[PDB]
């Protein structure tokens, strides 16, 4: 009934049922967190790969009529895999946006219409091909789909200069609960506000986003400084807490703390000549000099940050991630500096069996210039840095220890991080923060508030009221979707 309704508008070769020969290949292709590549995983009954907006509209209308819910997938980077799976058995279809990957740049306006199914690498390469002096402030990882990324805000190495990806969105085309294709002018100001940081799924299927391409100099500078415990790593991380968020908006210094060492990784929007003087005046303790400097163009810095010197600009078009593993992730936000003595205690947790990495990104600058209520992303002024706890493993048999570590370090970090509410990042999805409760075919406000306030703070109420206007029947839902407030 649902399938026959789809064939009226969507070609059968773009439709995959569980019995289709290409089903397994199409489902598994973008499942990034391998712990979900199991038989226990609740898989969709149907997979739809649209190539036009009318196909998405048809899918929604067909879904309403035949009682089939839709979970949309772009790059599939969802940490908890909510774009391709369900926690409990329920009938659903997946709208896979991967074939809608157009990046159309308006050369004379420096704007771009980017499809949700395009990965960040497609966007980055597209901008580079059109101009050597233009860039865009999105994530580090090349395989992230624009759809889920922008929906949750999205940040990377350019956050201190230009904010989030969503801060630079000027228009968008969304398919709502009624199957209407709406732009900014047509969806209203609340609906447009909601998709710019309010998380994916909840407010409909965003087909494409119009973004503002921003300037970057012809040469940028990258440095990677590794520091062990005996070289003063604990002292350097302590000082960094106040120095990094206060540095000029052209400089971003991120930390990757693993085991016994702390890697200071940076991207400076300028040359080595100007960077050395800046570092010796603001953070001399790091021992940074011109030997650490790697000068290159902006586009060349994109594969350099996660793939090393081996990565090329052409590698950005590869749709397979360089990370092929089972993972558990959690996030925190620090508002007050953590004392040296306590950083010593945090570092002992990194040599514990099953330990992962702590990735720390400094805020301040351009990200902190936007008011807390301007976009649904509330981590602006007052935030010093974001912390991401990441663990990787092999096989479901070695899952017990690294999973326990993430929860263990999180419990320990409680007095040092943000409180009332304990702020978390939506794109760093964590179901341990709570899931929705469904009473009367609708997700409840009270259950949504638990995790909601963590991700969105005071912006949760407006997000819930907006959901009440667009989708009161709660058609677009998952375990962590915005509940309707009437
Ligand atoms: C795996 C991975 C994730 C990363 C990485 N690096 C990041 C970084 O440097 N900065 C960040 O800010 N975030 C980083 N993330 C985290 C997140 O996983 C991503 O930021 C995105 O959430 C992933 O988006 P996408 O790849 O599109 O994932 P999906 O699983 O397809 O979707 C997530 C989510 O949103 C909904 N959704 C998808 N597409 C749409 C559209 N078009 N409209 C509405 N809603 C959409 C899904 O249903 C789901 O709920 C680095 C790595 C390696
Ligand atoms: C691709 O999708 C677009 C958008 O749905 C289709 O164009 C719309 O068609 C409907 C009727 O089906 C009209 O009411 C709208 O006015 C059209 N919108 C615009 C601005 O084009 C388009 O026909 C589809 N193309 C194909 C080949 O299916
Ligand atoms: C520059 O830093 C390097 C660290 O790799 C160090 O070996 C070198 O001595 C420094 N330059 C000076 C001042 O000699």
UniProtKB/Swiss-Prot annotation:
Post-translational modification: The FAD cofactor is bound via a bicovalent 6-S-cysteinyl, 8alpha-N1-histidyl FAD linkage. The N-terminus is blocked.
EC number: 1.-.-.-
SUPFAM superfamilies: FAD-binding/transporter-associated domain-like
Keyword Signal: yes
MF annotations from Gene Ontology: FAD binding; oxidoreductase activity
Cofactor (UniProt): FAD
Cysteine disulfide links: 5-62, 272-293
Pfam families: BBE (PF08031), FAD_binding_4 (PF01565)
Tissue specificity of this protein: Expressed in pollen (at protein level).
Family: Belongs to the oxygen-dependent FAD-linked oxidoreductase family.
Protein name per the record: Berberine bridge enzyme-like Cyn d 4
